[model samples]
Target: EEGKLVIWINGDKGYNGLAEVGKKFEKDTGIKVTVEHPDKLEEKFPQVAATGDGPDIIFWAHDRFGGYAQSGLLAEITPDKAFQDKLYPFTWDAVRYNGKLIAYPIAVEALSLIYNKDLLPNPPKTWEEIPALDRELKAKGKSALMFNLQEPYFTWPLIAADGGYAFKYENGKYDIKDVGVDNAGAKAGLTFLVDLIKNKHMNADTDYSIAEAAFNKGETAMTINGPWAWSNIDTSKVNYGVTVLPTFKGQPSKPFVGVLSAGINAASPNKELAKEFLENYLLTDEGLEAVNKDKPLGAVALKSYEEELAKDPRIAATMENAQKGEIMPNIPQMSAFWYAVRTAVINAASGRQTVDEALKDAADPGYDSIIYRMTN
Candidate 1:
């Protein structure tokens, strides 16, 4: 047909909701929207789009937008004033690279303090409070706040807790060359986490499944998990509440708030229609609500949806909690950071390695080599 467009999204339940919006788009416009979820959208998007053998629109986290935009793989997102005005200026920094907004953020995702409401009425306000609460919970045969220690994504907030970050976000733009993964602040933060794990209050072996299972089984009083985890938990069986992650030493333990973004391929023939779909329908009430049926899109980057999304008190709280966090960087350099930090945090938390050795190894010196290694 003359007006056919292809939109590739992740196979996750949250994105399946977005894919349904594509079906509605097909009906509303004469455009036949073919929604697909390639097994490796983030891994394969670059090579696929480079050869001009990809869909008009693709979905992935916004951090990758920088890498794709730099490679000229994504179309410059040019939603008009009304549409652009609708989105938050803060989130734009993540979607923009060089000088262009290369991708459009569809939804926000951030880790929240999910606690068993039956065991605890409110989450701890500070990290220090967690230990005492954990002790109290332990007396009742419950473990305290335990997250996936082996997963850097969950534990990375330890890095951010003390104002330590992988990249320096100065003024407005990030100085990519200035990698600060092993700063003193990060080491201090890591020490805080390692001590907790070493104390046996938090277990280094607690991976995602273990944490989710423990939380759902009432074996744990609280866990730091994203909104997506709520789906795995049957609320009827176990009552749960979502709150901001506990602050470390009275400072914000800012987790990385990732965006589920929809990007247009620069090489696509249906570029104009792609823009039309995003600006006209994707961000519209009907489109967002349709996609949001499965899960609260976290803190949507757009302001218009907040009031509508906030109608669900749980989602409103999730949005409030998420907006308090920092955006997760999806740049290709981050691939190296994950590999290095994953081993570092696991070893450090498990007492297998010194915090100094782990944090230094997780820093920038090896990242350049790691990037080359990733392409292979």
Candidate 2:
């Protein structure tokens, strides 16, 4: 409490909300709080921490923060048992690395199906239903699905809905050597995506900006996106509906859930005060309310916030029907999975390789290398 508690953050909704909470905390506790926004907190935080001069706290995604915990760059939060039960199980699990909690949750961000209700009276219920719907739309001279094939984040949900998992975890550790890319479920997912591209039902032409513009203009019937699009999408012309990603063969489509949480710096001068601030002020009802008002991405504190949000037809219908989404693994090698999957997907879509061959090759190397390293 003698010196200012400095917090570093990324320029995302979660970070912005944390800054607001920091302001409220400072006012109430009489502790000086300074929030810093960096262009890329991911890259910058490590450099600062390595130099023993990073802020006392930083806000970032749980998945991205995994490596820092594994590398011993983060302070373990497991010792603070009081904050444990206050979090949703999934959100809490996301921040745990090597039996230690490294971050705290502000909100859970996941992708959902957004559609023009005027064009399609009912949204498709499963991934398998997408193709027939696409064909029907094309016959009517309207595109059925618009997405950024160039971006793995957009394509990943389709893969997950088809029962594909990127990596496997065993005994509380990730073994990238156990890749799931060529697995039957993964193949099914890839095949669905390839067919969509081949039939021209979906294309890489719809980048983030283009997708928003087309959806607003009613050029496309549906897309998969996150809460950030809520404010930008024009809902005046068409009634819009949201649903969790559809399932394939009754296996639910699992979107990647990105959570933002607070963590105490290992070297903070006022470590106990910072911890107290998080428990008594940050996670409390008043603290969560202030943070949620500024961010408004999703539920702030799990229980009642989600139920209350569901009353708004748009959010309720989408999230209720959604399959449980998974947090992206925080393993350092997890990045390889994304890169390989994208490469294979692009190549297969462009006819460079058959779907099976593309996925097999894309995932094989990473898995083999990881397994080899782990075993040896």
Candidate 2 pairs with clashing backbones: 104-261, 161-253, 243-318
Off by over 4 Å in 1: 1-4, 11-13, 29-40, 232-237, 311-316, 319-324, 328-332, 350-352, 367-376
lDDT of 2 by residue, 321-345 (tens): 3337677887876555666676777
Q: In candidate 1, which residue pairs clash?
A: 63-330
Q: Mind giving the per-residue lDDT tens digits that candidate 1 earns over 1-376? A: 1358888877553666776877777887867888787776777888888887788898877867777777788888777777778888876767877777888877777777888888898778878776777888888888887678867888877678877788777896667877666888788888888888778789889887788788888888888877666666755378888876778767787777788788988888888888888888888877787776665566677688766666765676666666666777756566556767888888788887798887777775464433345554
Give TM-scores for every candidate, taking all chains together and pairing residue i with residue i: 0.85, 0.78
For residue 170, model 1's alpha carbon misses the true position, in angstroms, by 2.6
Alpha-carbon lDDT, every model: 0.76, 0.70
lDDT of 1: 0.76
lDDT measured at residue 198 in model 2 versus the true structure, 0 to 100: 80
